[PDB]
Structure formats: structure tokens, C-alpha cells
Amino acid sequence: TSEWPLLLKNFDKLLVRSGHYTPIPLKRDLKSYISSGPLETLLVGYKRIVVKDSAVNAVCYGAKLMIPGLLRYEEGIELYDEIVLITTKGEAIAVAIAQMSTVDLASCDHGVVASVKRCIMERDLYPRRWGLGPVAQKKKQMKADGKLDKYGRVNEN
């Protein structure tokens, strides 16, 4: 009664056939049983909003999508519509609720575009990147050169 997997809740609402009764070991994670086929067709029904790469990660963390993060939007998006947020690569980020209509998406210079209903993409697929050299490797090169202090640490100046 109390414990049931997500898709097995409201178990009473499930009807049996007349005749023999075969009573209802643990399931796996969706990511573990999911096919490697073209499953993105399951989201083709939803209207789309293309998110700027700089805003992708925030959406994976469940954060609201703001005007600076919007790149492209579909016609006919009405307030509160269930939509899909996609990258420029065509990856599905999340299923979201439209927080402004297509007319506002065209005009507004600020505000909430959409709020996340269900995250689809892993966190840190589009992480914050450092344009210059990796810091840990820079410290190793400094140990090799003797450019570090007596305590073996990077000093100020």
C-alpha cells in the first residue's frame, strides 16, 4: 500500500481480468533500462525554446530560464503551456512551464521565460569552463621550477 514505484502508485485504479489471479526482484534506474534508440521522438509533441549555451547548466539544476538565456522560441506558445527546453545541438534539457507568451518573448528585455517542471539532462554537461590553463597542472610546473614558497604553496606575488 504505502511503498510503490512511481508508475505503480494508485495501484487500486488498476483493474484485473476475470479468471485466474497471478499476484504482483527490484527494478533498475531509467538510465539503466532505457533503449539507445531514437527516444527523443517522445518530446516532438511539445513546443520548443532553444537555450543559450551559457544558460544550459542552470536549467539542469532546475533554475528558472530568464530572457538573457533565450535564443529561439516557437510560435503559439501561450502562458502556462508545457514546453521543452533544447540546446543548439538538439539535446533535450528539461520539460518546463511557459512563464510568458510568444508576444512577450519577442518584446520583453527582462523576466522569467519558463520554470522547470522536470530536468532531463545531467548536471555539468555544459559546465563553467576556464579559458586559460588548468590550475593544478600550473602548480605542478611551479614545483618543478621552484617558483613555490617554503611551505610548498602558491604565494601572493
Binding site: 511503498e3 514505484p5 512511481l6 534506474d29 539544476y61 559546465p127 576556464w130 590550475v135
Partner: protein
């Protein structure tokens, strides 16, 4: 293998492993049913060092310090740093006008909070001998809550519990011990842990942001037992509402709130507020260290590790930036 009990007063088992089959991505233990308290600390420390991303950390620091208006608008750091959650505003507004501000803050529980305490919490009596890990749990869970409250500018999201469970070692790692087997030191460890996790797991990884959250925990604790209950009820509701994460209420938060309501001490809470503040003020960037992968051996595959504190990472990044800006490329 013998089963290893967990949660409130180590009374629970089986619940967590069953949840991992339902998409519990908060749990970070490989084998929750067969990992002893000391092995949870060992696993946590190893996984925290693997999780920490120095490039992400450094990028966040550089955006805050040197980013233009467009960079800062998309990031959101400056807006988060100006935000005061509602619970803190309530305390600060009361404190500003209180004739004697060393006393506890008066609290009148809302109709919703009263219905919560009546309908959602266990009605059993508590006889817990070891109360110290429970007060430390309250501390860690308050930091998780405050950090989430700031990061989301006071509005919960579908991932609010994920954030809360991740910055909390008693949740993600079912670790109430915090320290490896070879009060004040445990408090300091709890604060450092919160900072290390707040710079490794959430969207915004910023030291000033982590310290802001600990300062707000101090204020909540100073407010007293009832203000702490207001926060605990909010935490409890955020987990209760999730079809998967509710297991953390079952194994920890249901009992911790009910035990705190009936057995929580105003004196212990005030002593805790003052001890945590003293420990927080004794800290600097030099206390926040990580082991990072500098390279991989091409022939061997073993990662080559290096130890750095967050300040060394910042200096190295500032040197690279100055070289990029001062010199023509």
C-alpha cells in the same frame, strides 16, 4: 555481509537501497545497506575530492571579480549575494526593534505549520542518549536550507530537495560522524564540510556565498528553538512533497523535527549559535583544501594528484589572466 543501520538514532535500514531503484540521485553511497559509519566518512571524502572542479570554481571567481554586466547578468552571483531569505528578514526585523536582543525571538506558528506538526510528524516520545550528532545534524541541515533559499531567491523548485540533500553529509552520505577514526572540533568540521560541498555540488560555487549562508544559520540559531522549528518544518515539507526524496523524511527528518520539538533545548541552541560563529570566524580560504588531478599517467592510467586550497587556485587564475591581458597574443 551484516546490515549497517542508518538515519535518526541508527534505527533505519532497507529504505535507501529501495529508493535508488526509484531514481534517488541524492544518495551518494555505493552500498548504503552495508557501509559502516567510518567507511561513509572515507567514501565521502574521496568522492568530494573527485567531485570538486577547480576550473568551474576558478571560472565562477573570475566572473564575479572581472566579469562585465552581461557575464554577471547570466551568472546571477551579484543578485544572490544581495538576497535575504524571508526567515532571516523576520529575525533581522525583530532584532532591529527588540529592547533586549539577547532574548529569544517570539514566534506564532501559522495555521499550515500547526496542521503540519499535527498531521505530518510522528507522535512517539523520544529517549535519545546521544544528542550531540542530532544538534550537529540540525546545524548541517540548516546550512543546506539557507543556501537553497538564497540560490533560488526564496522560491522552491523541483530540485530544491536535491540541493538540500547534496550540501548535507547526513543525507547524501548518511554520515552523522563527519570525522574519521584514526563538540567544538565537530562544529568546525561541519562548517568546513558545508563549504567544501557548496563549492563542489551546486550551480553557484562561490566562497562568499557559502560564508553568507553560514552567517544566516547563526542568525536562525540566535532566533531560538521556535525559529529553528519554522526552518525544519519548511525542510520537512520540501522533502515530503517529492515522490522519491520523501525517504529522507522517513529515515531522518520526521524524527529529527518531532524530537527537536519535544526535546530541543533553548540553552543548547544558544550555545551552538555562539560556538558555530566562533568556529566560522576562525576560518579562511586556506582551510578549504582539495586534492585535484593535475594529469594522468599515459602508460598507467593512474591520475596524478596535487593538493590546493581555494586561494592558491584564485592566485594561479589571476596570474594567467594578467598574462593574457597585459601581453599581446
Amino acid at each position: 555481509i551484516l546490515k549497517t543501520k542508518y538515519g535518526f538514532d541508527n534505527l533505519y535500514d532497507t529504505v535507501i537501497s529501495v529508493s535508488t531503484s526509484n531514481g534517488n540521485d541524492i544518495n551518494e553511497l555505493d552500498d548504503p545497506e552495508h557501509t559502516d559509519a567510518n567507511d561513509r566518512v572515507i567514501e565521502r571524502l574521496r568522492k568530494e575530492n573527485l567531485k570538486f572542479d577547480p576550473e568551474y570554481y576558478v571560472s565562477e571567481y573570475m566572473t564575479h571579480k572581472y566579469g562585465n554586466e552581461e557575464d554577471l547578468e547570466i551568472n546571477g552571483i551579484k543578485e544572490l549575494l544581495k538576497f535575504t531569505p524571508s526567515i532571516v528578514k523576520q529575525y533581522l526585523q525583530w532584532y532591529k526593534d527588540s529592547t533586549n536582543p539577547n532574548l529569544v525571538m517570539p514566534i506564532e506558528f501559522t495555521d499550515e505549520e500547526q496542521k503540519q506538526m499535527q498531521d505530518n510528524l510522528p507522535k512517539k516520545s523520544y529517549l535519545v542518549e546521544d544528542i550531540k550528532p542530532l544538534y550537529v545534524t540540525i546545524l548541517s541541515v540548516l546550512f543546506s536550507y539557507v543556501f537553497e533559499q538564497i540560490e533560488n531567491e526564496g522560491t522552491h523548485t523541483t530540485e530544491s530537495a536535491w540541493t538540500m540533500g547534496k550540501l548535507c553529509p547526513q543525507i547524501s552520505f548518511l554520515d552523522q560522524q563527519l570525522k574519521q577514526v584514526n563538540d567544538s572540533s565537530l562544529i568546525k568540521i561541519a562548517i568546513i564540510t558545508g563549504i567544501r560541498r557548496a563549492l563542489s555540488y551546486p550551480l553557484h560555487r562561490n566562497y562568499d556565498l557559502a560564508m553568507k549562508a553560514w552567517t544566516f544559520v547563526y542568525y536562525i540559531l540566535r532566533g531560538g528553538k521556535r525559529l529553528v522549528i519554522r526552518a525544519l518544518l519548511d525542510i520537512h515539507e520540501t522533502f515530503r512533497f517529492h515522490d522519491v526524496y520523501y525517504v529522507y523524511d522517513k529515515v531522518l527528518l520526521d524524527d529529527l523535527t518531532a524530537w527537536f520539538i519535544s526535546q530541543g533545548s533553548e540553552n543548547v541552541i544558544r550555545s551552538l549559535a555562539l560556538e558555530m560563529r566562533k568556529e566560522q570566524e576562525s576560518l579562511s580560504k586556506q582551510d578549504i583544501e582539495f586534492e585535484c588531478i593535475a594529469s594522468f599517467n599515459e602508460q598507467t592510467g593512474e591520475p596524478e594528484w596535487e593538493t590546493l586550497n581555494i586561494r592558491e587556485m584564485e592566485i594561479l587564475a589571476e596570474s594567467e589572466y594578467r598574462e593574457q591581458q597585459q601581453n599581446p597574443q
